[model samples]
Target: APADRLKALVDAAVQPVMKANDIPGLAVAISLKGEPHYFSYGLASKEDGRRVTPETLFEIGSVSKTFTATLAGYALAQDKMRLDDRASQHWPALQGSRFDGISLLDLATYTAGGLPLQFPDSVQKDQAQIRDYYRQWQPTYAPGSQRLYSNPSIGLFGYLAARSLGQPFERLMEQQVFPALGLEQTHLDVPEAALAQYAQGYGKDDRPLRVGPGPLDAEGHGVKTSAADLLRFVDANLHPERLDRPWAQALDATHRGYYKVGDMTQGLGWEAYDWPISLKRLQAGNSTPMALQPHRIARLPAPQALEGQRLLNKTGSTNGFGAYVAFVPGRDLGLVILANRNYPNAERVKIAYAILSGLE
Candidate 1:
């Protein structure tokens, strides 16, 4: 049975934020052991007066990289590529570039030899320009020297994964991952029938959101998904056979901690609190997040501090939207929070942690 207070806490914590921010609407989903508890607030389209629901689709921005990372992991597992495989290997298109020695793992972990965070204006946007830019761009530092978390790096990583897998990056998500997870409505472009259910984005200035050339060359910030699909993904992670083998393994690998990102520990695509020691409570809580991490070693430093239960999380933000996907791995729970307005992430993180505490 589900915890009644947990449901109440989810509602109370999320609703006011929407109201307080005049956010128009938002969607949130939670899961415990693959079972979901979902809620949607506000409207899907302020222009059309459509109501928001678990089905309303919103662009998840960089959160989509988790999907890309999953594909890379699968490629590594399939011997199509290795975590240490060079980015130039799969996309020979970059043969003469400074990306020469950068490996797939460096891109996966966002530590790719100090590439620019985004493509510069000098690249000139075009099919040929786009292709050639990566082919010629030089790295500012040695590969894997520091954690920069740039889209060019992550974008090329996704591009390589798709090329190695013999599919376009977007198509891989739609054809393999989405279908396997039963995510009927999650995608970069909304389905025709569901167009009316899409929420419009809002800028930080509270103006209507306008689309722009996105970050990470669209690899990092390109997907539009509904809370339902996001939850289904969480559900699949908690319950593998419910999803196909490839897709399931991909999602599972994404949650494995890989590198350090500020106060968090970054996995293949996900991030979590890296502590020197595991908590006795989490150790006893049947925490799937920690326990399921087959690759996490005991060597990493502890999270900045271990006062409260730690959180493993990933955040993505585009022009007018911000998305967060996280769960207390040790607690076997997950949350998906998508908002139209560009909300302050630190505040959202605080609220999410507080809600998790109350729910627990």
Candidate 2:
């Protein structure tokens, strides 16, 4: 019966949105009660005429932050460090400055004072330059006082987590996290062997684009993955019991809520709210203007635990691509959407909500 419904879902639910949005290529993966389903459409490379498949890699953008958070959680579960530990404790170069009192938890929760979405152009290139930028920087607000959705904030948090673990963030993810989670094709940097399967994303003007290597790549917008592997990652979140003892604990830790900003609750890297989640709430949380403006720390709210049919989800994008992943843990159902073109957040949520509500 689920299979039968999936057939109609592709035609009635998925296609109309793709057609209406003028999306050139996209992929979707669903895990219904632990059973996996994958559907892909359009060309991965329009010039080369390559069709998208479960194996085709698309840039996953900020979705990589959750992976970064999971890696940090693993470090914490192993007693390598505590969330309240100062990042400067691990990275000595960060000591004796504004970073002195900022805890790893502040960074992980995007409440590290007030980091911007990106660094000034002067510091955008080299690690040394980025460090110099931080040395002169001061937080606009006290640590833990506000959320300013920033890559630099979480990026530095991830870097310190890796430093504490004595591995580069990418290496830890590739050598440790990937294998632990049973993901074969998820990569922060696509390997040469897998080059053929990497999808070419298109800019808004129809020009092809891809993210280049950068200092903040690890903690911010770095991963590229196939729909099949991504679904497996989602499935692990849906059922952490499938993981080994340590990984299971780490996964559960990442899902624990740390704070709330506006209508959204922050858990490591995931944003969650009570379900059935309204379109308005999802839209407000992921709105484009929020990306541009730094949000004042709203009133502190209680941390939300995983209860009832809570909807946990994240949206991600690069200049050329967009991605969204969401799950209703109580229902044991989730969806992953990957597209080459940067699309609106509200539209992405609408499509996902339609499919998820139908399944319910």
Give candidate 2 misplaced runs (Cα > 4 Å).
296-303
Q: Residue by residue across 202-273, what tens digits does model 2's lDDT show? A: 886688889986767877888999989989988888888889988987788778787666777788888887
TM-score of each prediction: 0.84, 0.95
List all candidate RMSDs to the true structure.
6.5, 1.7
133 Cα displacement, candidate 2 (Å): 1.7
Q: What shift in Å separates residue 205 of candidate 2 from its native position after superposition?
A: 2.6
Model 2 TM-score, 2 decimals: 0.95
Q: Over the stretch 1-360, how does candidate 1's per-residue lDDT look in tens digits?
A: 456777678777877777776777788888866577777778766777888788878878778877777778677667687776767888767787767778877787666756665677766435577777777666666666566666777787888888888888778777876676677878766678877766888875567773455434457777788888887776665555456666656666665655443345666666666332334432322233322222222324422321124465667776777787767655667788988876766545644665666666
Q: Compute the lDDT of residue 35 as modeled in candidate 1.
A: 71
Clashing pairs in 1: 113-143, 113-144, 258-267, 272-312, 274-303, 275-302, 275-303, 276-302, 287-330, 289-329
- After TM-score superposition, the amount by which residue 28's alpha carbon in candidate 1 deviates from its true location, in angstroms, is 1.4
lDDT of each: 0.68, 0.84
| Residue-level error in angstroms, candidate 1, position 132 | 2.4
Error of 1 at 23 (Å): 1.6
